[PDB]
């Protein structure tokens, strides 16, 4: 459930990162009356031109707090003062992109494929909750332990209505190199455009943190996609793995895999990792 916190109960220790959304801190939560110190991440939101009423914020928080899955970062509490502060699970090892770049020489097929499974399970849960993420990338996956990762949201995720199949976005900055063509051209987002971004995220992992379409201007991306160019097969990937990824980047959104299928296929592979990824000195 949603805990409402007073300023007396938690403390920001240090900045972990920032962005348009605001700032995230490593923090400590000491709930009143209880006798425990809980390491947390505190996300303090940037002030908006038109701040929501507290009731609006609380309503969104309740829904957010109900997102309960092993592979999505949970909201534990909220403090509403002059700023909105969201108290969330701390992921001690940071984001997955930096983690795979810094530990590449010690990451094997088992870890990579398990991560693919976990991310797919978290995205499937989001889809079941009717949430379109809209910002899936290795940077937005966080590391609880080397064996356990969780997706999080920095503001772009959207709840779809019971009868809506798509989110139609407005203006602003978009992570072009992670987006499905239909999102780039028309600002349309669905669970299936999340699948496209999932594929790019997997490619990031399999290349140990290479930048997608390196050196290619974001403005030229939709053009090369229309020509049928995609991200290249990572050298460690077998054709079977690369084909799943390529399938995530079909032009036809409904020809892309569903996350439930991605869970199944990557679970099969994670069960015999060295068959599907070939990494020197893996064992
Ligand atoms: C804007 C954006 O995409 N980001 C991604 C990370 C950051 N947001 C974040 N970071 C969390 N934890 C964390 C972060 C860096 C470290 N390293 C330890 C190793 N050093 C060499 C460098 C510091 C360690 C832990 C974190 N934990 C939970 N959350 C969410 C749920 C609010 C986090 N967000 C800002």
UniProtKB/Swiss-Prot annotation:
The keyword Transmembrane applies. Changing residue 4 to A: Abolishes phosphorylation. It comes from the Eukaryota. Keywords: ATP-binding, Cell membrane, Developmental protein, Disease variant, Disulfide bond, Endoplasmic reticulum, Endosome, Glycoprotein, Golgi apparatus, Host cell receptor for virus entry, Host-virus interaction, Hydroxylation, Isopeptide bond, Kinase, Lipoprotein, Membrane, Methylation, Nucleotide-binding, Nucleus, Palmitate, Phosphoprotein, Proto-oncogene, Receptor, Repeat, Secreted, Signal, Transferase, Transmembrane, Transmembrane helix, Tyrosine-protein kinase, Ubl conjugation. There is a cross-link at residues 14, 35, 52, 55, 165, 227, 258, 268 (Glycyl lysine isopeptide (Lys-Gly) (interchain with G-Cter in ubiquitin)). Changing residue 272 to A: Strongly reduced phosphorylation. Changing residue 43 to A/M: Abolishes kinase activity. It is found in: Cell membrane; Endoplasmic reticulum membrane; Golgi apparatus membrane; Nucleus membrane. The modification Phosphotyrosine is found at residue 167. Changing residue 17 to D: Found in a lung cancer sample. GO terms for biological process: cell morphogenesis; cell surface receptor signaling pathway; cell-cell adhesion; cellular response to amino acid stimulus; cellular response to epidermal growth factor stimulus; cellular response to estradiol stimulus; cerebral cortex cell migration; digestive tract morphogenesis. The active site is at 135 (proton acceptor). Ubiquitously expressed. Isoform 2 is also expressed in ovarian cancers. The modification N6-(2-hydroxyisobutyryl)lysine is found at residue 43. Phosphorylated on Tyr residues in response to EGF. Dephosphorylation by PTPRJ prevents endocytosis and stabilizes the receptor at the plasma membrane. Dephosphorylated by PTPN1 and PTPN2. The keyword Glycosyltransferase does not apply. Its main location: membrane. ATP binds at residues 16-24, 43, 88-89, 153. Changing residue 17 to A: Found in a lung cancer sample. Receptor tyrosine kinase binding ligands of the EGF family and activating several signaling cascades to convert extracellular cues into appropriate cellular responses. Known ligands include EGF, TGFA/TGF-alpha, AREG, epigen/EPGN, BTC/betacellulin, epiregulin/EREG and HBEGF/heparin-binding EGF. Ligand binding triggers receptor homo- and/or heterodimerization and autophosphorylation on key cytoplasmic residues. The phosphorylated receptor recruits adapter proteins like GRB2 which in turn activates complex downstream signaling cascades. Binding of the ligand triggers homo- and/or heterodimerization of the receptor triggering its autophosphorylation. Heterodimer with ERBB2. Forms a complex with CCDC88A/GIV (via SH2-like regions) and GNAI3 which leads to enhanced EGFR signaling and triggering of cell migration; binding to CCDC88A requires autophosphorylation of the EGFR C-terminal region, and ligand stimulation is required for recruitment of GNAI3 to the complex. Interacts with ERRFI1; inhibits dimerization of the kinase domain and autophosphorylation. Part of a complex with ERBB2 and either PIK3C2A or PIK3C2B. This is Epidermal growth factor receptor. It comes from Homo sapiens.
């Amino acid at each position: 459930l949603l805990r409402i916190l007073k300023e007396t109960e938690f403390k920001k220790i240090k900045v972990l990162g920032s962005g348009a959304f605001g700032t995230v801190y490593k923090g400590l939560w000491i709930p009143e009356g209880e006798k425990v110190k809980i390491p947390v991440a505190i996300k303090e939101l940037r002030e908006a031109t038109s701040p929501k009423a507290n009731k609006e914020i609380l309503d969104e928080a309740y829904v957010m707090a109900s997102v309960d899955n092993p592979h999505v970062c949970r909201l534990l509490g909220i403090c509403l003062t002059s700023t909105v502060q969201l108290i969330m699970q701390l992921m001690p090892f940071g984001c997955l992109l930096d983690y795979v770049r810094e530990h590449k020489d010690n990451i094997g097929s088992q870890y990579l494929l398990n991560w693919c499974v976990q991310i797919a399970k978290g995205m499937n849960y989001l889809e079941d909750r009717r949430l379109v993420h809209r910002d899936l990338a290795a940077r937005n996956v966080l590391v609880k332990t080397p064996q356990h990762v969780k997706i999080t949201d920095f503001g772009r995720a959207k709840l779809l209505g019971a009868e809506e199949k798509e989110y139609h976005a407005e203006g602003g900055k978009v992570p072009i190199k992670w987006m499905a063509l239909e999102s780039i051209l028309h600002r349309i987002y669905t669970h299936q455009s999340d699948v496209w971004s999932y594929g790019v995220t997997v490619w990031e992992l399999m290349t140990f943190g290479s930048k997608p379409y390196d050196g290619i201007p974001a403005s030229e991306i939709s053009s090369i996609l229309e020509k049928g160019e995609r991200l290249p097969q990572p050298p460690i990937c077998t054709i079977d793995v690369y084909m799943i990824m390529r399938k995530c980047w079909m032009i036809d959104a409904d020809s892309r895999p569903k996350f439930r299928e991605l869970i199944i296929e990557f679970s099969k592979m994670a069960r015999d990792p060295q068959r599907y990824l070939v990494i020197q000195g893996d064992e």
